[PDB]
Amino acid sequence: ASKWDQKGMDIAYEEAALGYKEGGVPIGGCLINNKDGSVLGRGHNMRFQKGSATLHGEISTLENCGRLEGKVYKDTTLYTTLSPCDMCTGAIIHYGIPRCVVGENVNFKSKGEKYLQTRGHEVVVVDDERCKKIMKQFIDERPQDWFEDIGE
Amino acid sequence: ASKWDQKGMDIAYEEAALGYKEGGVPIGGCLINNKDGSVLGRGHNMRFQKGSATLHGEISTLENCGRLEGKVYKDTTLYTTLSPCDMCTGAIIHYGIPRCVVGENVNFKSKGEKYLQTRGHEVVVVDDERCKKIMKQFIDERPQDWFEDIGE
Ligand SMILES: [Zn+2]
Ligand SMILES: [Zn+2]
Ligand SMILES: [Zn+2]
Ligand SMILES: [Zn+2]
Numbered sequence: 001a002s003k004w005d006q007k008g009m010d011i012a013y014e015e016a017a018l019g020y021k022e023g024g025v026p027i028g029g030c031l032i033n034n035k036d037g038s039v040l041g042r043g044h045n046m047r048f049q050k051g052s053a054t055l056h057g058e059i060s061t062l063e064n065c066g067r068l069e070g071k072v073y074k075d076t077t078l079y080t081t082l083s084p085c086d087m088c089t090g091a092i093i094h095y096g097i098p099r100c101v102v103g104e105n106v107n108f109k110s111k112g113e114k115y116l117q118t119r120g121h122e123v124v125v126v127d128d129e130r131c132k133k134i135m136k137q138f139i140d141e142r143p144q145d146w147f148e149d150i151g152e
Numbered sequence: 153a154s155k156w157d158q159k160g161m162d163i164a165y166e167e168a169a170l171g172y173k174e175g176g177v178p179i180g181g182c183l184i185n186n187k188d189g190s191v192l193g194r195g196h197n198m199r200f201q202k203g204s205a206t207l208h209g210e211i212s213t214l215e216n217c218g219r220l221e222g223k224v225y226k227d228t229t230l231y232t233t234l235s236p237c238d239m240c241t242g243a244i245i246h247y248g249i250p251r252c253v254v255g256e257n258v259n260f261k262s263k264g265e266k267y268l269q270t271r272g273h274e275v276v277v278v279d280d281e282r283c284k285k286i287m288k289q290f291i292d293e294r295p296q297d298w299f300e301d302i303g304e
Contacts, residue, residue, distance in 0.1 A: 047219065054206070054215045054243065063206045067199065070304045090242025090264070091206070095303045111271075112242065119263075151247045152222045 008079035019044035026134040029061035029080040041065030058088035081131040103131030156189045160231035171196035178286040181213035193217030210240035233283040255283030
């Protein structure tokens with residue numbers, strides 16, 4: 001089940017780092033087919049890049065996969081550098097993506113992490129230090145922007 | 153509490169009808185400030201228009217409101233022509249939008265409708281037959297497209 005998890009989190013981290021370089025929030029993701037390891041799409045938070053309230057890393061990832069038949073999502077893993085908010089949790093549930101692998105849940109965690117599990121989805125938190133470090137750097141440099149991004 | 157609800161559902165329906173005319177799925181929305189009735193944004197499903205897997209009517213509506221401080225969402229109502237999926241439910245929860253007014257829940261309903269309420273959001277289903285009729289027309293004419301849109 002975990003065969004592609006290093007590949008997936010490496011891509012998600014690359015997306016976070018790219019977003020950071022663009023002036024955005026360093027949250028990245030990708031969607032991988034569990035059978036063959038192919039990458040259906042990858043993305044990062046586009047709040048700053050696009051003035052976007054909805055393009056979280058996870059949402060941008062799914063957008064970048066394009067229109068798909070519903071069946072395609074059912075044997076994928078969504079990789080995200082940060083534990084998903086209620087909206088991104090809802091996307092995973094809506095599309096029936098069975099597995100979500102999370103870089104870290106230290107800098108952010110919503111009720112969504114547990115809700116995924118109650119709705120029958122697998123959540124794996126890998127506690128990736130690279131993810132924790134880049135996210136903490138953003139929180140330390142741009143706390144007001146982070147507060148906007150979390151929507152409180 | 154319901155002062156702006158006719159206005160809001162009228163705008164949501166206009167957005168659904170516009171989307172229908174553009175060749176898309178007839179689901180529309182708007183976000184209104186509860187105090188003064190001002191429209192923060194309005195939108196419709198953009199699957200066909202933009203090849204979008206994530207721009208549901210509710211998501212498009214929120215995107216069209218732009219970047220906002222989190223406090224702005226806390227005294228709004230989101231109007232949608234159709235009862236929200238788990239992703240759109242999650243967006244409402246994430247941003248703390250206290251009220252969701254729904255055109256109809258006959259053509260579609262998710263576990264989100266009830267989840268909204270247990271998470272502390274008011275859900276009002278007005279059973280607007282304009283919404284029900286246009287949505288059913290789309291489902292009747294384009295069942296394959298509908299199936300794709302709901303992620304099944
Ligand atoms: Zn997130
Ligand atoms: Zn999110
Ligand atoms: Zn919907
Ligand atoms: Zn939706």
